[PDB]
Swiss-Prot record:
Localization: Secreted
Full-protein residues shown: 27 to 150 of 150
Organism: Bos taurus (Bovine)
Reactions the enzyme catalyzes: an [RNA] containing cytidine + H2O = an [RNA]-3'-cytidine-3'-phosphate + a 5'-hydroxy-ribonucleotide-3'-[RNA]; an [RNA] containing uridine + H2O = an [RNA]-3'-uridine-3'-phosphate + a 5'-hydroxy-ribonucleotide-3'-[RNA]
Expression across tissues: Pancreas.
Protein name, as recorded: Ribonuclease pancreatic
Record annotation: effect of changing H12A: Loss of activity
Family: Belongs to the pancreatic ribonuclease family.
Keywords of the record: Disulfide bond, Endonuclease, Glycation, Glycoprotein, Hydrolase, Lyase, Nuclease, Secreted, Signal
Length: 124
């Protein structure tokens, strides 16, 4: 099955654009990445940076993850990110999202060898 690393790429990496270009970014991306297949995933963040810059977070600032785990890392720099949040009108299978573009620090949980991001914790 899909690896945790690959799922991370699928769910959160958008190196093809440097920012969301229209309010429909979220609707399009959430659908195209298969995040609304089984249900409308309520929230999702996409990161507009190269994979190697995101992977590099795993060797940046170690912080506790929201749930208490100690394998989280916070990026030294801000990153271009797109926040996607389910709208009051969202109704499966027509999931609908609000797009919010921002430059923030990202926090990811890392695992394995190579030690890479497997989960998006938060943006600060």
């Amino acid at each position: 099955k899909e690896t945790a690393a690959a799922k991370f790429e699928r769910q959160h990496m958008d190196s093809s654009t440097s920012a969301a270009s229209s309010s429909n970014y979220c609707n399009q991306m959430m659908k195209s990445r298969n995040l609304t297949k089984d249900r409308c995933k309520p929230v999702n963040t996409f990161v507009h940076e190269s994979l190697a810059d995101v992977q590099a977070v795993c060797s940046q600032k170690n912080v506790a993850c929201k749930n208490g785990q100690t394998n989280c890392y916070q990026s030294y720099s801000t990153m271009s990110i797109t926040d996607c949040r389910e709208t009051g009108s969202s109704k499966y299978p027509n999931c609908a999202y609000k797009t919010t573009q921002a430059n923030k620090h990202i926090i990811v949980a890392c695992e394995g060898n190579p030690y890479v991001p497997v989960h998006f914790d938060a943006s600060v």
